[PDB]
Amino acid sequence: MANFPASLLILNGKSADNQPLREAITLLRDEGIQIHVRVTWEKGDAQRYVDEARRLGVETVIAGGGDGTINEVSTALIQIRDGVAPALGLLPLGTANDFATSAGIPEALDKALKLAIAGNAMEIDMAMVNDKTCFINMATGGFGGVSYLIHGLMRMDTLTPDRCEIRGENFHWQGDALVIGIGNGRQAGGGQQLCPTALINDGLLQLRIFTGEELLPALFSTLTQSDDNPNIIDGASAWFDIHAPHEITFNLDGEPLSGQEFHIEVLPGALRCRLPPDCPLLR
């Protein structure tokens, strides 16, 4: 049990009846291991249980669910408070598991629980948008069958390039953009690689601008072709300022955000997270 600090588990209602997990937890609770369990029903709950988690003094808050749940927990975990925030643990259960997957967290439910409770925690970055919202994995923006891939990666339907200005460290670009990709992580919308170089502990944010009228084929392209594609502009910076005369809307790991101005900054080592010793996203 010394190898298993206490832990509160925030579980998405969509898995509230997942028996195999119930059994795994029951076993662990048998060795004197403390594992609290809470289940969310809507947005806002995660925050509530992370707060109880702090009060309970647990060392780990495990997010059980998809990227949306990881984001809500992580967000609540970086909230400026009194005392040392618990570390973040990952238990992939949602349909959308991009971050968890990209980070290399075990498929085996029981094997992921061990990592989330016993694993060592590495400090990692986080992106903040307009000082109000956050995201740990990916932000994608655009203006306005294979449609499922377009709507699966974003709340968009039929994209159209519109004008927007973008600034960052040693970076200034302007023109018509179809899709703006800013990642802390590397993939989104179910396996689609967008910022293949991203590292979650470098203090940077990978930017990827897709120009032109087409997009899907670029997506199915190799890393060699995408590099020769004049309609793909890569960038990297701790921050980015986006200005779009016509309202652009981003998708922050599931949560929509619209507007004409976006300030995006990395919050270096904002939270600890139990990742495998050889995580692909780690410097």
Which residues carry a binding-site annotation for ATP?
Answer: 40, 66-72, 95
- Say whether residue 97 binds Cl ion (CB under 5 A): no
DSSP 233-278: EEEEESEEEEEEEEEEEEEETTEEEEEEEEEEEE-TT-EEEE--TT
Q: Which residues are annotated as a binding site for Ca(2+)?
A: 125, 184, 199, 202, 204, 226-227, 229, 232
Strands (E), 41-161: 60-65, 87-92, 121-124, 127-129, 133-135, 138-142
- Say whether residue 142 binds Cl ion (CB under 5 A): no
Confirm whether 255 is a catalytic residue: yes
Contact predicate 195/188, CB 8 Å: no
Token code pair at residue 74 = 């992580």
- Say whether residue 100 binds Na ion (CB under 5 A): yes
Phi/psi zone of residue 201: left (φ > 0), alpha (ψ -120 to 50 degrees), beta?
alpha
| Dihedral (CA of 82, 88, 94, 98) sign | positive
- Say whether residue 219 binds a second copy (CB under 8 A): no
Site for Na ion in 49-68 (CB under 5 A): 67
Among 151, 172, 246, 283, binds a second copy (CB under 8 A): 172
Beta bridge partners of 174: 165
Nearer to a second copy, 18 or 229 (CB): 229
- Say whether residue 135 binds Na ion (CB under 5 A): no
Residue 125 site contact among Ca ion, a second copy, Cl ion, none (CB < 5 to 8 Å, cut-off depends on kind) = Ca ion
Give the residue carrying structure tokens 């289940």: 39
Residue 98 CB, shortest distance to Na ion, in Å, is: 6
Binding residues vs a second copy (CB under 8 A)? 170-176, 209, 211-212, 228, 230-231, 233-236
Catalytic residues: 255
Binding residues vs Na ion (CB under 5 A)? 67, 97, 99-100
Binding residues vs Cl ion (CB under 5 A)? 12, 65-66, 68-69, 94
